[PDB]
UniProtKB/Swiss-Prot annotation, chain A:
Intrachain S-S bonds: 4-58, 5-20, 8-54, 10-18, 28-35, 32-47, 37-45
Keyword Disulfide bond: yes
Keyword Signal attributed: yes
Species per Swiss-Prot/TrEMBL record: Glycine max
Keyword vocabulary terms for this entry: Disulfide bond, Protease inhibitor, Serine protease inhibitor, Signal
Residues of the site described as Reactive bond for trypsin: 12-13
Any GO CC annotation of this UniProt entry: extracellular region
GO molecular function, one term: serine-type endopeptidase inhibitor activity
Function: Inhibitor of trypsin and of chymotrypsin.
Protein name: Bowman-Birk type proteinase inhibitor
Curated annotation (Swiss-Prot), chain B:
Pro-peptide positions on chain: 143-144
Species of origin: Bos taurus (Bovine)
One GO cellular component, as annotated: serine protease inhibitor complex
A Pfam family hit: Trypsin
Domain (Peptidase S1): residue spans on this chain: 12-239
Enzyme Commission number(s) of this protein: 3.4.21.1
Protein name per UniProt: Chymotrypsinogen A
Length: 67, 241
């Protein structure tokens, strides 16, 4: 499954450095390097990575059909 | 409280089986299908403490007195939940203040295998480096699709929040306490259960299993809800209800 992150909290920096807050069950983002999870079933997981870029916001923009 | 009728023997990933009945406050949280998804601790005959993130509702059942969840011959108590008190300060994104109280609809019947853990005072000082114990039915291996049937245990040290931040950075809040990174780890299915330290000979609830490495790495610390930072809210919730 290809990368994507809805909420991307980029911060004060140049180049940028960003942080995703998306909650995912079972596991993180396939390209997450450091993932944390609650120890429940199903586990609630978050990516704690810090990249200088955001992945496409998972959800489509749904704004290209109506003139 | 905190004095088990059956004495635990200490020599969860890389843990060991508990002596049966030796953690008498450990309860199982199970949905309507009988599936264990979280743990909890009895603090008296009428209340259980667990993690907020577990999402327990009144349709879940508290199971007390189990050692082997695959057994049908143990004398276990299946306790309905009358009311859920999820700490309103719990933040599902930061996972901070991760505590929930369950009011049982009928009182538990204490015995050799069912009793209460002690609660600390908000001022208690549990020193970094103390060896404590955590128990639960969580995965014994991250690759597993199968929790263990028998209650597991592990000994592990407490960290200072300063040292814990060296692993997890700004994720660590004052209402959190870390333990482990020592060859053992809590893992999926352990959430809500106890991290206990023996204070004046009595096992005392210092932490609630919360979160950690997504693969239950035994070289990173587990993060627990810090009970000293939440126990006045626990005591006041009980006094009001």
């Amino acid at each position: 499954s290809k990368p994507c992150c809805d909420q991307c909290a980029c911060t004060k920096s140049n180049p940028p450095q960003c942080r995703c807050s998306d909650l995912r069950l079972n596991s993180c983002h396939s390209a997450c390097k450091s993932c944390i999870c609650t120890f429940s079933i199903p586990p609630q997981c978050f990516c704690v990575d810090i990249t200088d870029f955001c992945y496409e916001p998972c959800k489509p923009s749904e704004d290209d059909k109506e003139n | 409280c905190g004095v088990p009728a059956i004495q635990p023997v200490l020599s969860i990933v890389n843990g060991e089986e508990a002596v049966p009945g030796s953690w008498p406050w450990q309860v199982s949280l199970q949905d309507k299908t009988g599936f264990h998804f979280c743990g909890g601790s009895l603090i008296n005959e009428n209340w259980v403490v667990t993690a907020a993130h577990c999402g327990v509702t009144t349709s879940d059942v508290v199971v007390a007195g189990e050692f082997d969840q695959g057994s049908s011959s143990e004398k276990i108590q299946k306790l309905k939940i009358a009311k859920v008190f999820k700490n309103s300060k719990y933040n599902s994104l930061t996972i901070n203040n991760d505590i929930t109280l369950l009011k049982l609809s009928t009182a538990a019947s204490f015995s050799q295998t069912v009793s209460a853990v002690c609660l600390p005072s908000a001022s208690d000082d549990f020193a970094a480096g103390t060896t404590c114990v955590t128990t639960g039915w969580g995965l014994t291996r991250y690759t597993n699709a199968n929790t263990p049937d028998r209650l597991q245990q592990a000994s592990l040290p407490l960290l200072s929040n300063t040292n814990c931040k060296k692993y997890w950075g700004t994720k660590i809040k004052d209402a959190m306490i870390c333990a482990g990174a020592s060859g053992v780890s809590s893992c999926m299915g352990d959430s809500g259960g106890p991290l206990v330290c023996k204070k004046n000979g009595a096992w005392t609830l210092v932490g609630i299993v919360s979160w950690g490495s997504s693969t239950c790495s035994t070289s990173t610390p587990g993060v627990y809800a810090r009970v000293t930072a939440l126990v006045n809210w626990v005591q006041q919730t009980l006094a009001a209800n």
